[PDB]
Amino acid sequence: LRGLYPPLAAYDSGWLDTGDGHRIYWELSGNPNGKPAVFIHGGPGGGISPHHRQLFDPERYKVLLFDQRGCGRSRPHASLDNNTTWHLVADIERLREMAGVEQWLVFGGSWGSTLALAYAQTHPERVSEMVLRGIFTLRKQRLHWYYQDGASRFFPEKWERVLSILSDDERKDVIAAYRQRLTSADPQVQLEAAKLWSVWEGETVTLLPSRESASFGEDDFALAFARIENHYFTHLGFLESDDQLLRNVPLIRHIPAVIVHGRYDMACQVQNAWDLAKAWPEAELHIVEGAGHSYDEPGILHQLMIATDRFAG
Numbered sequence: 215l216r217g218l219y220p221p222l223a224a225y226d227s228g229w230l231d232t233g234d235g236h237r238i239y240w241e242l243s244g245n246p247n248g249k250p251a252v253f254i255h256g257g258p259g260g261g262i263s264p265h266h267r268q269l270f271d272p273e274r275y276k277v278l279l280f281d282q283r284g285c286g287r288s289r290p291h292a293s294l295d296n297n298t299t300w301h302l303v304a305d306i307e308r309l310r311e312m313a314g315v316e317q318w319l320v321f322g323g324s325w326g327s328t329l330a331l332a333y334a335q336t337h338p339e340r341v342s343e344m345v346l347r348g349i350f351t352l353r354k355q356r357l358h359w360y361y362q363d364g365a366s367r368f369f370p371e372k373w374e375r376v377l378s379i380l381s382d383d384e385r386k387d388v389i390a391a392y393r394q395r396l397t398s399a400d401p402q403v404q405l406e407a408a409k410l411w412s413v414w415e416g417e418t419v420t421l422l423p424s425r426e427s428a429s430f431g432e433d434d435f436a437l438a439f440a441r442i443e444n445h446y447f448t449h450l451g452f453l454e455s456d457d458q459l460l461r462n463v464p465l466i467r468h469i470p471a472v473i474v475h476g477r478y479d480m481a482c483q484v485q486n487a488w489d490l491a492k493a494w495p496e497a498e499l500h501i502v503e504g505a506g507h508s509y510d511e512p513g514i515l516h517q518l519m520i521a522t523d524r525f526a527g
């Protein structure tokens with residue numbers, strides 16, 4: 215199976231002041247004369263890591279990677295002010311103009327596929343092609359599956375830990391219950407909930423268990439991760455309608471796209487990828503058997519590498 219390209223340092227980076235209170239971190243990697251691509255991380259609030267640079271051929275791609283508002287190296291850390299889907303779409307444009315890119319390929323997995331779709335449907339003429347993984351459209355059925363009743367039935371022993379700090383009444387709406395704790399004035403209260411919320415996802419994003427899931431418990435990461443994720447879900451991704459993203463697919467059906475989704479993705483059900491493909495015939499769908507949610511699941515990674523190399527030659 216195809217794997218990641220070897221490690222490489224970025225060739226340029228900085229912070230872009232948005233003008234409304236945020237300084238967003240960005241970096242350029244690969245070849246400054248290559249094909250332009252933008253990497254959109256997941257979460258929301260997940261951040262980028264050096265490994266994400268290795269997803270593109272260093273010779274053929276010019277990759278712009280950035281940390282979305284409030285997470286990673288973007289300041290202020292864990293800020294929920296002016297932190298919405300539409301501000302992020304605006305930020306992607308600012309980064310575009312700054313890199314002198316007229317049009318580029320959008321690569322996004324999980325929440326990244328969500329923002330990728332929102333961005334593409336808002337600025338169609340700015341997207342040459344798309345590589346989507348672990349489709350997440352933010353419909354209420356998708357939120358309910360992962361945070362109220364669904365994935366919980368496959369990991370009952372883990373779900374029990376997420377509910378441990380909740381009273382019986384709070385358990386009827388876990389998202390809202392965590393929203394209260396993640397936004398209290400007591401930072402110790404916030405952190406206790408942030409850890410539980412983050413680790414739930416870290417341990418259910420891969421087919422088999424991995425020690426690496428523990429990194430989802432680190433204070434700084436967990437705090438921003440939990441707050442931002444919960445903030446966006448509390449507001450239904452700031453969408454006008456439940457199915458806005460699937461409903462506006464007509465605006466981007468002309469754009470070449472590949473969809474990779476693991477059969478046993480417990481964070482985002484394959485149904486989302488099926489529904490998207492149902493509305494987007496032109497798109498190329500790949501349901502990977504034996505794989506979970508994460509991008510580095512062997513079978514999923516293999517398809518992502520083929521997809522980026524293909525759009526490059």
Ligand SMILES: C[C@H](N)C(=O)c1nnc(C(C)(C)C)o1
Binds near residue numbers: 325509
């Ligand atoms: C919705 C989901 N929490 C998400 O976007 C996400 N978190 N981590 C990831 C990956 C798979 C990219 C590590 O995706």
